């Protein structure tokens, strides 16, 4: 069920805390070299990360951030549930992170790492994907 299929997909993510950060980097297969300062680095930007535990579902996301958030369901912050994305700029044109519950996201810093949610530039709505 999509509680299981949310489970698979968030240890999916969880699997790859300390892959470093690179520009353009990653996809739906795993970590990859990047472009501009990540052309000699194999990791994940943010949306990568996404596409690569989202694809623990089957589905390929769109690779931007931004269309992530167009093509998704929005709900509202006081709703969040664990596998729920959370995005960054206006339109949620700048990053994207995993929601976990409790306070806590999947994000990739300079490498992929859990974190506080962060506020700055939070963009309103989250997506619910499942």
Not at 40 to 55: C, E, K, M, R, W
Not at 93 to 103: F, I, N, P
Not at 112 to 123: C, I
């Amino acid at each position: 069920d999509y509680q299981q299929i949310t489970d698979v997909v968030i240890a999916r993510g969880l699997s790859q805390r300390g892959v470093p950060f690179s520009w353009a980097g990653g996809g739906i297969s795993g970590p990859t070299r990047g472009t501009g300062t990540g052309i000699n680095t194999v990791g994940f930007d943010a949306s990568g990360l996404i596409q690569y535990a989202y694809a623990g579902a089957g589905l390929k996301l769109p690779r931007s951030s931004g269309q992530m958030y167009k093509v998704g369901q929005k709900v509202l912050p006081q709703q969040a549930r664990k596998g729920d994305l959370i995005f960054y700029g206006p339109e949620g044109t700048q990053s994207v992170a995993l929601y976990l519950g409790k306070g806590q996201m999947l994000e990739v810093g300079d490498v992929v790492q859990v974190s506080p949610v962060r506020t700055n530039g939070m963009t309103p709505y989250l997506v619910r994907v499942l």
